[PDB]
Amino acid sequence: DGLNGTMMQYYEWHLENDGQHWNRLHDDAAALSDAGITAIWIPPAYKGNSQADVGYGAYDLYDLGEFNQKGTVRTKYGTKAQLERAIGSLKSNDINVYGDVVMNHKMGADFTEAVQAVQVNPTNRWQDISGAYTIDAWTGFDFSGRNNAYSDFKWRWFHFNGVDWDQRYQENHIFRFANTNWNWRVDEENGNYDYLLGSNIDFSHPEVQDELKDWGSWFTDELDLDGYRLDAIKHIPFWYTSDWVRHQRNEADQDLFVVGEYWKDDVGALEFYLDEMNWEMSLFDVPLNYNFYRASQQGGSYDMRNILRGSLVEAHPMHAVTFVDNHDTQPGESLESWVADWFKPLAYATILTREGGYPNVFYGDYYGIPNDNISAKKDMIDELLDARQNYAYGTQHDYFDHWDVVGWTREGSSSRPNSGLATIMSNGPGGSKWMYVGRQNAGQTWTDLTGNNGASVTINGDGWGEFFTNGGSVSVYVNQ
Template sequence: MENGVLMQYFEWYLSPEPHLWTLLKKDALHLKEIGITAVWMPPAFKGIGGIHDVGYGVYDIYDLGEFDQKGTIRTKYGTKEEYRDAICALHEVGIQAYGDIVLNHKMGADANEFVKAYEVNQNNKNEVTSGEETIEVPTVFTFPKRQQVYSDFTWNWTCFDGIDYDILSKRHATFLFKDKHWDTQVDGENGNFDYLMGADIDFSNPHVVAELEDWAQWYLEVTGLDGFRLDAVKHIGAHFYKDLIRQLRQHYQKELFTVGEYWHGDVRRLCNYLNEVEGEVSLFDVPLHYHFYEASYANGNYDMAKIFDGTLVQIANDKAVTFVDNHDTQPSQGLQSWVADWFKPLAYALILLRKDGYPCIFYGDYYGIPYSQISGKSELLDCLLFLRKNYALGLQRDYFDDSSIIGWVRDGPQKSGLVCLMSDSVGGCKTMYVGLQYAGTYWYDALGNYKAHIQIDGQGNGVFIVNGGSVSVYIQANE
């Protein structure tokens, strides 16, 4: 899988109809044909929002669209059987399936209980700002409609560290339960960034950890997934996923590729997490996404030669999953940082046509986002994927020697080299060496942005041209 490509197969505003699992099953062969090797599927378990829950408002992780809970049997994406059918369809064409795992919190409890707790400072969760008080909290999860099928584990306040609402006083605040502590090995923002939302799961509780380990084995056996995308890992003690993923790999003797979402623009935070989990997971390259975002709104004043500086793909390329946008960065979302449309071809060339990183394509970029009147770029991405599969191979020579125009050459096997050249400002040219074996040959822009052919001289050099605010990818013309 030298040139594997992951696709995130959902965006935030997808309609519940038609069922996404059914669409994915029908789309499997097409995905294979365009060069997708793995699919990141959205969270498959029942959420508090019923058929409208994107999957992150977690209620019951054992309900994959099988039980009548939260007003629906199916999830937003379909039924349990449709989910398994979609995974089977991917496997039949040789595509791996990754499941989105959301274990940081639970929501939509079946009953409330009274708990002693302390209010903490929102800006420093380690600072207690109240005396001990009794609050009423939704922390009892019995899943009565499931009737203990698959698991008889009952969740109560002892399974959680804290919560953000007191029903008794109708007060929104962050509460830490008495005799509890926020998890360690989490992000240091706000003093301690264990708490994110809902009832915050206590990963120091051995009964909770055992239940989640049992669930993970059940989930793999029921679905046949090939790996995971881990949600909100900076809010969960690193030791938990380090141990869990290691145990699952040993038990099943499978690679179980796993990528975590550690949302931070400082690559040092990501590297620290990779050290804490001892390399058991990869991470999304959030700093690189922010570089794309910044460059796309810099009016041609971004230093393109430094586009990879301070990114995960530069520092730990074997652990970097590169991406342009996702469901959190799309318009109207909490982390909105949507890369400008004109820069999307440049950004996708930067993740798809280079040797480092594991690129992830976003459903909203490929198929569009009707909610935000955003059109899909399937034609562009199909072309880049074709080039990645057939030409973006072999040694790589970089020409990151200009603040505006940058490029690189890939050697490729059997005279199938590739030259990529891009500019965030005015157009121009760059002399680039492709190899003596190409002397006298003609090359053309496979993206069609520059129309004329380029001839390689006797020393194996070509003067390649790019238009302003554009990208060109040159390959050898048929002789």
């Protein structure tokens, strides 16, 4: 019903390996719906390297915590039945389910295999640094415990094209299988960034292309997904991802949202990928992530006018999925770029109250990251979910005119009661700003949903009001 959409990544890196996360999801369903969350992005739901695996150390894409494999029956999140019980709850509470899809590699092979390989230069995979010789890579996959349920396809070295560990002499190197080429096209950082970690899948092989397509469909029907969150797609040949997506949509009756993770602080790089994609999917706004990050590290000196400059959402707010942080960017992880507590309220307001982009709430922020003493920001985020769910509607008006104090407004829509809002904030000494909000809201008295400013702004006859904000804070006034 014209209700704004808000997605949530329901997991964080340091979640407990108590296998109870799927059940948590099943109970938090309504609460989440109620708060303004319309779609949940679940973590990899299939068997990883080990049970405590977050999901990216993917081993058996058909084992959704149903078969005793890799030292466990359940995944870190729980069993298959508990996942299905969860997804059912979400559906009943009007929440779409987007599954995380890991096709770039595989890890936890059951046995090694003799393979001709050459060492490449880590900074330029095009350049070999050694001659061809036999290495013992972990490429054999039999999924013994599964017993061929759903699929009897087994993986062998000739399906991959590279690994980063030779078991024969036990050394680390970026090995390209001899007589195999690095996937293409793929991100050109390090020359060719096809290889990332684990056993890298070579998509040039038709039996691979069809197996993952076949799996994708199996997966999508089995869990009744409503979309996907495509992982590490910058290391996966672009053509195949576009291929896979089209194939997937072709097989499913239900619609399929598709956000891909092309991790590069470069909107151009993302735009390019969306060209080859024919904009048939959105991408996580990674430049925005680093914009917020820079602002958080830098302090007030950061010029708030260039906060959206460079973001993907600025350029293509229709194929953008905005967020503040995730499991990769949280403290201590691989793509760390954590937004500090002080600026995090400002960032969330930016992606949750503006009209562009598809905003995503991070579990680690909502409920907190105990591991690192990071407090649950639930209170601050709910008020903003309230903002987006009931007020952030109608014509927008921006004011990125000052280097500290900046803001924007939404006139509201006649189709949604008392909607309409005005966001004001400052990353430095506070202040106020005269902003337009629609001559139709004249006479109204607006107040701050976050409670960071007791100002009570009244809209004059011209539809104008002067809004205030304290230093390094953000307020969101609405007709409440």
